[PDB]
C-alpha cells in the first residue's frame, strides 16, 4: 500500500497510479534505479481517485513511466535542529556545500498552520540591523515582519546581509533563504557570510534559478520550519539557548513566479497577472508563522525579512501589494536615491514600521525622534531647494542640516554599526555639533569618531550600552561624558 507506479510524467507533475493510504501532502520517494543513484522526492497533492498527482521536487527528466514510487509515511518535512547551523542545504534539507551529511534528531513538517492569535505578544525586543537609517527610522523588533521592497539592483540583498552580519552577539539564529537567485549570487552571499564569520549562526537554504519549480516553492517553507524550530525549541548559540531567530526570504517575487509556474503547469485557472488565485494565501501562510510568542508559549520569536523586487518602481503591482498587506512594515529602496550616491537608498517619506516603534531601545528612539522630524522638514524644504539666495536663514540652515543628516545616513556596505556607536553618532548630529563639518567629509568624520571611540574611549561606549535601556537616556553622566568626548575629538581634528 506504500508503493505505486508512475503512469505519466509531464509538466513537472507525475501521476503515481495506485498509491493509496498516502496522506494529502506526503513526500513520495521515487527509489533509485539504473542510471539514477540518488532518490528524488515528490509531493503528492491531488489525491484524486485511482491517481495521485505528485510534484517532482527536482528535474522531471530523471523519472519515466513505470518507475516505482514508495510513500515515506511522512507529510513533507525538512530536517531541522542544531546540525543545520552553519550549513547550506537544499529546500528538502539535503546539503549542497559538500561539507558532509546533515545531522539531525527530529524533523519539523513544513506547511503547518501558524501558532494563532492568543499565542502571541506585542514585540518589545529590538533587532539591530546595523544600518543607521533603518535602525533610527524603521525600527525592527524580534518577531516583526519587515518587508524589504526595491527595484532590482538597489541593495535589498545587501541590507539583508548587513542585518544578518550584525546579529553576531545578539543571540539570533539568522536564516537566509535564496529563492530563484542565480547560483553565482548565492555563492557570493555564502562567501561573504563566511568571510565575516557570521556563517557560524546562519542557515542558508538555496533554491536557485536552474532548480525545478517544485523547489523555489517549498524553500521558504523549509526556512520557515527551521525558524519555527528555533523559535519553539531553540538551539545552543555561544553556550546559551536562543529562541529568537531571523529569516530572510530574499526574492519572494521569484517565489510567486515559481508558484505561478507550478499552478499553470497543473492547469489551475489563472488570476490577476496570471498568478493563481491563492498566491496571497501562499505568502500569508508563509509569513504568518513568523511570530513573537508570549511567555507562556515559550517567549520565542521569529523575525521575517521578505524581499520583493518591483519593476520600474511600481509598488502598486499584485505581489508587492500582497506582501505589503501581509507584513508589518516596508523598507522602500528607491532606485533614484541609489543612483544618486545614497547607497543605503531609503524612501524615508513612505517607508514605515507600524509595529516596532515601541520595540526600540529608549536611547535610539529618544535621539531619533527629532532626527525623523528634521528629515521631514528637509523633505518639505526639498521644493524650495531650487531657489538661490531667496531663502531666509532658517530655511537655509534646515536644508544644510538635512543634507548633513542624509550624508550621515549614507553608510558603506559590509560595515554594521553597534547600537552605542549609532546612538552616539545621532546624538552628535542632532545637537548642532556637526553644523561646522562640511557635507562631503561627514562620512569620514563618522568613521574617525567611531575609531576614536573604539580606541580612546571604550568606557563611554560601555556606559552608553549599559544605559541604553533607561527611560530617560540623556542622563547627566552620559550626556557630559559624550559631550566631552565629542569636544575632545573636535579639538583634535
Amino acid at each position: 500500500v506504500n508503493v505505486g507506479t508512475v503512469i505519466a510524467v509531464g509538466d513537472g507533475v507525475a501521476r503515481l497510479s495506485g498509491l493509496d493510504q498516502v496522506v494529502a501532502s506526503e513526500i513520495v520517494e521515487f527509489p533509485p534505479k539504473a542510471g539514477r543513484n540518488e532518490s528524488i522526492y515528490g509531493i503528492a497533492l491531488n489525491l484524486e481517485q485511482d491517481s495521485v498527482a505528485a510534484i517532482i521536487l527536482g528535474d522531471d527528466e530523471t523519472i519515466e513511466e513505470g518507475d516505482m514510487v514508495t510513500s515515506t509515511g511522512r507529510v513533507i518535512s525538512v530536517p531541522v535542529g542544531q546540525g543545520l547551523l552553519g550549513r547550506v542545504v537544499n529546500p528538502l534539507g539535503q546539503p549542497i556545500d559538500g561539507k558532509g551529511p546533515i545531522v539531525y534528531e527530529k524533523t519539523r513538517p513544513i506547511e503547518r498552520i501558524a501558532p494563532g492569535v492568543i499565542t502571541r505578544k506585542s514585540v518589545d525586543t529590538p533587532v539591530q540591523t546595523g544600518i543607521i537609517a533603518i535602525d533610527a527610522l524603521i525600527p525592527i523588533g524580534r518577531g516583526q515582519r519587515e518587508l524589504i521592497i526595491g527595484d532590482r539592483q538597489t541593495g535589498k540583498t545587501a541590507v539583508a546581509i548587513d542585518t544578518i552580519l550584525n546579529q553576531k552577539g545578539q543571540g539570533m539564529v539568522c536564516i537566509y533563504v535564496a529563492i530563484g537567485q542565480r547560483r553565482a549570487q548565492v555563492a557570493q552571499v555564502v562567501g561573504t557570510l563566511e568571510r565575516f564569520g557570521a556563517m557560524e549562526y546562519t542557515i542558508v537554504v538555496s533554491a536557485t534559478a536552474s532548480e525545478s519549480a517544485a523547489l523555489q516553492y517549498i524553500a521558504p517553507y523549509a526556512g520557515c520550519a527551521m525558524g519555527e524550530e528555533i523559535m519553539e525549541n531553540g538551539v545552543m548559540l555561544n553556550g546559551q539557548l536562543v529562541k529568537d531567530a531571523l529569516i530572510v526570504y530574499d526574492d519572494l517575487s521569484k517565489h510567486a513566479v515559481a508558484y505561478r509556474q507550478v499552478s499553470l503547469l497543473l492547469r489551475r485557472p489563472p488570476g490577476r497577472e496570471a498568478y493563481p488565485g491563492d498566491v496571497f494565501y501562499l505568502h500569508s501562510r508563509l509569513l504568518e508563522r513568523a511570530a513573537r510568542l508570549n511567555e507562556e508559549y515559550g517567549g520565542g520569536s521569529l523575525t521575517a525579512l521578505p524581499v520583493i523586487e518591483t519593476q520600474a518602481n511600481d509598488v502598486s503591482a499584485y505581489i508587492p501589494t500582497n506582501v505589503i498587506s501581509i507584513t508589518d512594515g516596508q523598507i522602500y529602496l528607491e532606485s533614484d536615491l541609489f543612483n544618486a550616491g545614497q547607497r543605503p537608498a531609503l524612501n524615508v517619506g513612505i517607508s514605515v514600521s507600524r509595529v516596532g516603534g515601541a520595540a526600540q531601545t529608549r536611547a535610539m528612539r529618544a535621539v531619533a525622534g527629532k532626527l525623523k522630524g528634521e528629515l521631514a522638514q528637509f523633505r518639505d524644504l526639498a521644493a524650495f531647494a531650487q531657489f538661490a539666495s531667496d531663502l531666509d536663514a532658517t530655511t537655509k540652515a534646515q536644508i544644510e542640516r538635512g543634507q548633513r543628516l542624509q550624508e550621515l545616513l549614507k553608510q558603506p556596505q559590509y560595515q554594521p554599526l553597534p547600537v552605542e556607536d549609532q546612538v552616539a553618532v545621532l546624538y552628535a548630529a542632532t545637537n548642532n555639533y556637526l553644523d561646522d563639518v562640511p557635507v562631503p567629509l561627514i562620512t569620514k568624520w563618522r568613521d574617525d569618531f567611531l575609531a576614536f571611540l573604539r580606541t580612546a574611549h571604550p568606557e563611554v561606549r560601555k556606559l552608553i550600552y549599559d544605559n541604553r535601556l533607561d527611560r530617560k537616556f540623556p542622563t547627566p553622566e552620559v550626556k557630559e561624558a559624550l559631550e566631552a568626548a565629542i569636544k575632545e575629538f573636535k579639538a583634535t581634528s
Partner: protein, 70 residues
C-alpha cells in the same frame, strides 16, 4: 486471488521452491497469482510485491552502504 503478486528473488529457484513461495503466503489469500523474475542484481533476499505491498530484503543493504560512505 483478488490481488496478484510479483515476488522476485536473488537467483532462479526450483519448481518446489516456487510452491514454497506460493504456500508461505497464507496471510493474505493463501495462494495469489504470482510472477517470478531473477534479475541477478538481487543478492541474498526476496522482493515480494503482494497486493500493493512491497518488502525489500535484497540489495538494499549494499545500496544503503553507498549513502553511508558517500
Amino acid at each position: 486471488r483478488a490481488v496478484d503478486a510479483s515476488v522476485t528473488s536473488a537467483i532462479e529457484l526450483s519448481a518446489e521452491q516456487k510452491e514454497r513461495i506460493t504456500r508461505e503466503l497464507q496471510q493474505r489469500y493463501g495462494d495469489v497469482h504470482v510472477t517470478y523474475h531473477v534479475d541477478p542484481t538481487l543478492i541474498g533476499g526476496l522482493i515480494i510485491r503482494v497486493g500493493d505491498q512491497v518488502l525489500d530484503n535484497s540489495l538494499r543493504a549494499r545500496l544503503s552502504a553507498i549513502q553511508r560512505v558517500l
